[PDB]
Amino acid sequence: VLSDNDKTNVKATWSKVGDHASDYVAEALERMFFSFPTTKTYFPHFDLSHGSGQVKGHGKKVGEALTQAVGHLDDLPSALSALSDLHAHKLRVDPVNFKLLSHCLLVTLSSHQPTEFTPEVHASLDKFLSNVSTVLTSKYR
Amino acid sequence: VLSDNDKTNVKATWSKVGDHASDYVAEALERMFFSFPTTKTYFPHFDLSHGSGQVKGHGKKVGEALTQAVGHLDDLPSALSALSDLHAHKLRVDPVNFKLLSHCLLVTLSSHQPTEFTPEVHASLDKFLSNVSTVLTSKYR
Amino acid sequence: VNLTAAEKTQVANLWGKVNVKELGGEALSRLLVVYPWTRRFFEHFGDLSTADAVLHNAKVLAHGEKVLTSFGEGLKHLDNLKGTFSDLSELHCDKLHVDPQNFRLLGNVLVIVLARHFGKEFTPDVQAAYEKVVAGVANALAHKYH
Amino acid sequence: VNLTAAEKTQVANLWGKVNVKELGGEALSRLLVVYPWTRRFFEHFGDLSTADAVLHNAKVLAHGEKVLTSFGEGLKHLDNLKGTFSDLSELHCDKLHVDPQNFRLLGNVLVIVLARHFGKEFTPDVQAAYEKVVAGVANALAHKYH
Ligand code: HEM
Ligand code: HEM
Numbered sequence: 001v002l003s004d005n006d007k008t009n010v011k012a013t014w015s016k017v018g019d020h021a022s023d024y025v026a027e028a029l030e031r032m033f034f035s036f037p038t039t040k041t042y043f044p045h046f047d048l049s050h051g052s053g054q055v056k057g058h059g060k061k062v063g064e065a066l067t068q069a070v071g072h073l074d075d076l077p078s079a080l081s082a083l084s085d086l087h088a089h090k091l092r093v094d095p096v097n098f099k100l101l102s103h104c105l106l107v108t109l110s111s112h113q114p115t116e117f118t119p120e121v122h123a124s125l126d127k128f129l130s131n132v133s134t135v136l137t138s139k140y141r
Numbered sequence: 142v143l144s145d146n147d148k149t150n151v152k153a154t155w156s157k158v159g160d161h162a163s164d165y166v167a168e169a170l171e172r173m174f175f176s177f178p179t180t181k182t183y184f185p186h187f188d189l190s191h192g193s194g195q196v197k198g199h200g201k202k203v204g205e206a207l208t209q210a211v212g213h214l215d216d217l218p219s220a221l222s223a224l225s226d227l228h229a230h231k232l233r234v235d236p237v238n239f240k241l242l243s244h245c246l247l248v249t250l251s252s253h254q255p256t257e258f259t260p261e262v263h264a265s266l267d268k269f270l271s272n273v274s275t276v277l278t279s280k281y282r
Numbered sequence: 283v284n285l286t287a288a289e290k291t292q293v294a295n296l297w298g299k300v301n302v303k304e305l306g307g308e309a310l311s312r313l314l315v316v317y318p319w320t321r322r323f324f325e326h327f328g329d330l331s332t333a334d335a336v337l338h339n340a341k342v343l344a345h346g347e348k349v350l351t352s353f354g355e356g357l358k359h360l361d362n363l364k365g366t367f368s369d370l371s372e373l374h375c376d377k378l379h380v381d382p383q384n385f386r387l388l389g390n391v392l393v394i395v396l397a398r399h400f401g402k403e404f405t406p407d408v409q410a411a412y413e414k415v416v417a418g419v420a421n422a423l424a425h426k427y428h
Numbered sequence: 429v430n431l432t433a434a435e436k437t438q439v440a441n442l443w444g445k446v447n448v449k450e451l452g453g454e455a456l457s458r459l460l461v462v463y464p465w466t467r468r469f470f471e472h473f474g475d476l477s478t479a480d481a482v483l484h485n486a487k488v489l490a491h492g493e494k495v496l497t498s499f500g501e502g503l504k505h506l507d508n509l510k511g512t513f514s515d516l517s518e519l520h521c522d523k524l525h526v527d528p529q530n531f532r533l534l535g536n537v538l539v540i541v542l543a544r545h546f547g548k549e550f551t552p553d554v555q556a557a558y559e560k561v562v563a564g565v566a567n568a569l570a571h572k573y574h
């Protein structure tokens with residue numbers, strides 16, 4: 001579980017993202033697909049071009065899951081259990097790809113909220129996204 | 142925490158290593174220093190040549206810690222807490238290096254106990270060494 | 283790759299004793315058992331649902347022989363791994379989009395398999411030579427990503 | 429590195445607006461804050477005991493300007509990163525023994541720093557170009573390990 005200081009920073013940052021969560025996560029997914037084209041092969045069923053309704057819809061869902069995580073930092077395994085089964089068992093997502101999406105979430109937050117994105121906030125958000133990624137890949141134990 | 146099946150495999154394998162633990166870990170450390178010379182810089186105070194008393198002594202200590210871990214699979218954070226502080230806070234060991242030592246432990250076990258080192262035993266031991274490594278680097282949260 | 287002359291002969295001597303059918307099936311099946319996400323690339327080989335399914339999969343075992351035969355082509359061309367693996371880099375990067383971290387994992391499993399079969403013969407010095415070789419093969423296969 | 433012509437001009441245009449003193453201190457200090465084991469290599473720069481110590485360390489901040497100046501030398505020689513970084517690869521690999529994974533982490537932090545300063549200008553297309561560049565610089569700096 002995240003340290004107290006990191007939990008505080010993550011909840012502060014997420015509160016400042018506010019209603020921009022779905023737009024920012026959709027942008028993070030676009031950044032991942034553009035920068036790391038290997039990741040596109042998990043979404044052959046989507047239109048991945050800019051302005052994609054499927055990517056926008058998906059960003060909203062992923063943003064909702066991250067909002068749930070920020071509310072359940074002490075029980076991420078249970079809060080995310082169905083998503084862990086989806087990503088590790090059904091989809092077999094390569095663990096490297098969670099790093100790529102986490103990096104693109106940090107790029108997106110840094111670009112949109114530069115004053116808020118201090119080195120300490122960066123460190124706490126990196127730890128939050130690592131902990132979410134660890135839970136989503138837990139089947140690989 | 143490791144799954145039941147993995148705990149069983151790890152305790153079976155460690156029991157078969159038995160009194161060879163100190164010799165096998167010392168060999169794993171030698172394999173790491175020979176194969177991955179970047180790791181030698183954490184031990185400038187040791188003679189790292191073959192037959193080193195310091196490497197042999199160290200292998201015994203690391204083997205003892207692994208034996209403790211195999212006995213405390215449900216509370217690795219507490220069982221290894223002083224070692225976590227040593228490796229992440231005092232020594233600042235790069236997380237990549239735990240992968241290198243874990244791989245060299247698997248090479249050493251596979252070489253010495255080939256019949257015992259099945260694909261399922263390999264998978265369970267890889268997960269055990271990942272979980273020990275995660276606890277030892279937990280300060281990097 | 284920069285192998286000493288002593289390491290070049292260690293590498294070539296051990297490889298001369300390798301059963302590429304037995305050890306290549308073993309290496310690829312261990313990759314899919316130990317790092318299960320790699321099964322995503324082989325779903326068209328049939329049942330990969332459990333480790334026991336992977337270990338009995340005739341296509342996975344046959345494919346592993348192809349992979350070790352290709353590693354042996356690397357060993358013959360240590361001065362030109364990039365060219366030796368050019369076509370295969372295009373396949374894995376441009377067609378299959380395998381993340382190149384996985385190439386390192388398969389090299390890890392190959393070293394473990396060699397240790398299992400060679401025992402005391404796979405000394406720390408012989409391992410270190412193979413570690414240089416599998417790093418160079420991985421880097422070469424990743425070239426089309428660079 | 430293979431940049432399109434459009435990506436070559438995006439990279440060069442953004443770099444023309446970079447304050448290498450401000451962003452280079454920021455990048456190196458963020459590496460040491462976010463990935464604390466990297467402090468091991470800089471212990472001789474004085475107090476690195478806390479993030480606040482890292483962020484106020486005059487030597488860490490000055491050193492970061494050197495690092496970004498060297499990245500800018502890469503940008504001038506995208507066709508020959510290996511040669512441009514040869515000497516620095518020897519230093520980091522042969523003298524300092526920095527694990528090359530860390531080169532990728534510093535590139536990650538540089539992309540984040542560019543995004544912070546350039547905002548809406550650091551579009552997904554401009555990021556993708558920089559991702560190719562920092563991957564190529566990392567691979568080049570790691571060459572003496574190969
Ligand atoms: C922070 C990391 C992630 C989170 C929180 C996240 C969350 C989610 C959520 C909430 C869903 C929808 C689940 C449902 O409809 O029941 C989903 C689906 C999916 N995710 Fe992720 N995910 C993450 C990382 C990744 C990565 C790294 C990849 C691959 C590069 C990935 C690939 C997929 C795919 C292919 C689907 C199914 C998409 C569809 O058919 O609509 N996810 N994820
Ligand atoms: C499974 C992983 C590891 C375990 C279980 C382990 C365990 C231990 C133990 C038991 C000690 C002695 C502690 C004491 O004397 O109080 C120790 C010390 C030390 N370890 Fe590790 N370690 C691991 C990985 C690593 C790695 C990957 C490195 C660096 C490559 C490392 C570098 C060191 C160093 C430099 C010392 C102090 C040595 C001395 O001065 O005698 N350890 N470790």
Ligand code: HEM
Pocket residue numbers: 320323324348349352353370373374378380384385386388389419420423
């Ligand atoms: C890094 C060492 C590797 C070597 C030397 C290697 C070698 C080869 C070779 C020789 C082929 C057959 C080429 C042909 O028929 O034209 C092949 C195909 C393939 N490789 Fe690899 N490979 C490596 C790693 C991997 C990894 C790590 C993965 C996935 C996790 C992978 C996935 C595949 C797939 C999916 C095929 C095509 C299978 C099919 O025929 O449908 N390879 N590889």
Ligand code: HEM
Pocket residue numbers: 466469470494495498499516519520524526530531532534535565566569
């Ligand atoms: C990958 C991108 C990097 C670039 C372009 C880079 C660039 C440079 C440059 C230009 C120097 C000064 C060279 C000289 O004075 O001759 C240097 C020194 C150094 N670099 Fe890096 N570096 C990189 C990554 C890293 C990483 C990731 C680390 C450690 C985690 C590191 C640790 C050092 C150290 C310890 C020095 C010597 C400091 C001293 O003067 O005592 N470098 N680097």
